Design a protein around this nucleic acid. Sequence first.
RNA 1: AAGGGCACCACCAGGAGUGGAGCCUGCGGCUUAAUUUGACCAACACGGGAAACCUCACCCGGCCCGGACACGGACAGGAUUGACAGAUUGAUAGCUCUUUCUCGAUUCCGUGGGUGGUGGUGCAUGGCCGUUCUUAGUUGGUGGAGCGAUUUGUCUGGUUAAUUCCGAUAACGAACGAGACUCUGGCAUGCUAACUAGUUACGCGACCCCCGAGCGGUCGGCGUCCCCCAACUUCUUAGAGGGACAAGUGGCGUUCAGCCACCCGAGAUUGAGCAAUAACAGGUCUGUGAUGCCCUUAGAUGUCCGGGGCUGCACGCGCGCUACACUGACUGGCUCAGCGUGUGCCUACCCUACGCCGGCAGGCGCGGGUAACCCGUUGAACCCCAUUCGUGAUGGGGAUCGGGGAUUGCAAUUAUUCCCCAUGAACGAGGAAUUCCCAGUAAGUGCGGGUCAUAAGCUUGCGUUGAUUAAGUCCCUGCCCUUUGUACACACCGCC
Lengths: 67, 114, 104, 55, 98
Amino acid sequence: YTTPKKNKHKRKKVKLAVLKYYKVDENGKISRLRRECPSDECGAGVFMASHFDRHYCGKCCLTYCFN
Amino acid sequence: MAVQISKKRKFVADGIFKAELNEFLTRELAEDGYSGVEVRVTPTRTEIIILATRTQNVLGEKGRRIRELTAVVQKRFGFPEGSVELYAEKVATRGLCAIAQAESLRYKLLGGLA
Amino acid sequence: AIHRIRITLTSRNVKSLEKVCADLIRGAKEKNLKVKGPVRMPTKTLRITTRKTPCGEGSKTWDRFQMRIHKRLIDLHSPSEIVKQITSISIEPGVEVEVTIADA
Amino acid sequence: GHQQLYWSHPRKFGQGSRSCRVCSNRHGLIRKYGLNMCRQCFRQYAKDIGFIKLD
Amino acid sequence: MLMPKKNRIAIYELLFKEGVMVAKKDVHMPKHPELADKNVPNLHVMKAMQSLKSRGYVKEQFAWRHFYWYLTNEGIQYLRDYLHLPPEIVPATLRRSR
RNA sequence: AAGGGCACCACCAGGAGUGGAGCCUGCGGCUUAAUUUGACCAACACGGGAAACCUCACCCGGCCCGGACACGGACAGGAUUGACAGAUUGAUAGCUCUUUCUCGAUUCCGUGGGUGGUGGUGCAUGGCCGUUCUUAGUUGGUGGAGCGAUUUGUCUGGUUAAUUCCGAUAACGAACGAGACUCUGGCAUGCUAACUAGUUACGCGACCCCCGAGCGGUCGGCGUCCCCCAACUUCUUAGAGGGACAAGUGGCGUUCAGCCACCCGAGAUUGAGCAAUAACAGGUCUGUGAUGCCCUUAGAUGUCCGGGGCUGCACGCGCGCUACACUGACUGGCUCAGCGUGUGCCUACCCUACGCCGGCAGGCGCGGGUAACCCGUUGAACCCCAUUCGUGAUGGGGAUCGGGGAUUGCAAUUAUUCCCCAUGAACGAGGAAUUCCCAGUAAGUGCGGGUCAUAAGCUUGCGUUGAUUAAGUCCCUGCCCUUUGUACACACCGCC
Ligand SMILES: [Mg+2]
């Protein structure tokens, strides 16, 4: 054997806690702080990603780019 | 015509079906005194007759096992539904069948007789 | 219906082919349908030559396998209807039968 | 990996597109008359198919 | 096997409707032929039936390139309480016209 | 060592050759990251092994689990799975990193335990196959002989392809092998049958002769199972039957078994298949979901993907192809086959008529055929008939090599194949050696199948043309039987 490369470290997920990325104010006023994927396959339930320079839909895999 | 294959390929496919069915029945009904298989094919329907010594054993509880094998041979080769019938026939003079006697000898040797 | 039919019988063995081509036409004569004579098509000889050994070591002996397919044609022609008259086939395992009409 | 490279290599033809219908071997196949059977498996089963020796 | 519910229950109900099921040995087969509308890969159905064999609810027979799985009496009640079915509907091989 | 018999895997008389040249291909060697590997009469165009990917088993890298099941942790406040962008990578492998979304109990971690393996072991094995050996050999029961291993049966002789038979006979009665058997080829104007085969006759036609023929000649032109609107099976097909038996004659023979010659006859010896006891450390674990044991099993010897390799070259050998030319090459014309295949479960990839474009390889539309219906009356080659060449490495030979054009494929470079134009290298019949063969045979010659997306210098079959020599022998190489010798018994490749 004697592989020249070291053992490839397999990816370990970030182990995210409870999501809680939406907030209401003054005894309840809804505020989506995340973008919504508008496709039928994504639906109105799931939330899109809020990447620092685009938005990604978890199901629809649509990426909306803002320049 | 175009839908039906030529006679050469049709006869070869019939032989392939016979061989595959015989191998399946050998590997499945080995402990039940399997002797042979005979297929009578007609355009209307087909009849598969399993020559075996222990008919009451190849036929399960109220024909459960023969129904199972009928469904298996239905699904594997894709006959039209209700176009294949499987019967079990007891062989005559089982001492003259080399298949049955070889299977019995194999059973005895696996049991552990000298 | 006014019908004219063709029945072709094909299998691997001459004994069963001959006995079918005999009993069918005898039934036709007893059932007074005039018979176009049995036509024996040339035999199809499927030949496969394969090396005997499973290894490739030896004296290069070849085993040749043959499959003889024989087929016969009988034309049933009657002034009246044919299919409603003849319904029984009396076909043993091994032989394959195909019935067409003059249109096909 | 994923579905885009697991089986992406074409096998619409060639020796790797064909295998024995009995033992899944890829050498010494017999495709004549649509047999699709290995050289050894055909000798094994020729009695069952009906290919018998005459000369 | 990472195969989901939407095909696990499909395979299980196919296996319960008739006491047998036949699967050609082809892990690369894109689609198992019957239940053509469920998008169930042959690898998934093969490994599901293999797990059932290991747990003892189905017995396996192997011809040339096929599995011929036969569901067992130990598989009867496991399929029944996995699919949440009262013990009144039976597989096809069990009861016919009676 | 003797006696008898036999074999073109022996010779004799010969034929074609091989060994000499070029090339193809398979081994060894060399080189390499790898040039995967088995096999050394009975290995070396063998593993149906003509490998671009796959095949693939080798090398260089990269993914995935396709690690069942049980138990314990882990957990819906989330076990865990995918994925856009940037880097990263060969890669549009979310493979890893930054980044946040998303599946939801299917999985994750640990321990036992699977499973898979073209990994090892054919000197652990099965099956198959090769060889001893396709020679004629092999065995029991009861009886006889021997203390017994054993022996007789199973043989002095004649005869046969054959322990094949006649005969003798301490053996009698059997069994296998041989033979018999099956397929195949040859004759059937005898039978049955034919619009998926035809023939004859007749009728429409088309052309020549028309001097005048005229029931003149040609037609693979159209018709007569289009159903009343001809018959028949010689030709073709395939079934049942017949036929050949040393049957008849002469000679030889113990006048037996049989042998020789001849008549009549299609045939007086057609080729194969099957094929005994006992064996081999013969070959295959790289055919198998045949398989014991051992090895590996998550950084895989599993599996998938990309690239390379199996082709690599101072050299040696084997099976072959092309030739060395005039008994020929080129050019044109004429003219004849038979095997057999053809559209796919997965599986995509069939044989092709005709028309058009192109010089060719090819391309473009129209069809036919799942087939005695279409390719196809398989217009094959050799050969035959005329032309040019003229004894020169020449119009012999076409290796090597350059440029260009198509086809297959996802991909043609280390050129897949094909086409065109240039280059005409060795080679002037081949040392010592050595192979195969007795009649439709050798040889010349093409055509099918297998391999095949592309394809044959291979192999398995088919047809065409068609001989020289021989009807013997044990001389060489071997084989069988009997006697004999042996200090061999792993058996003369012994022993010493
Ligand atoms: Mg020239």
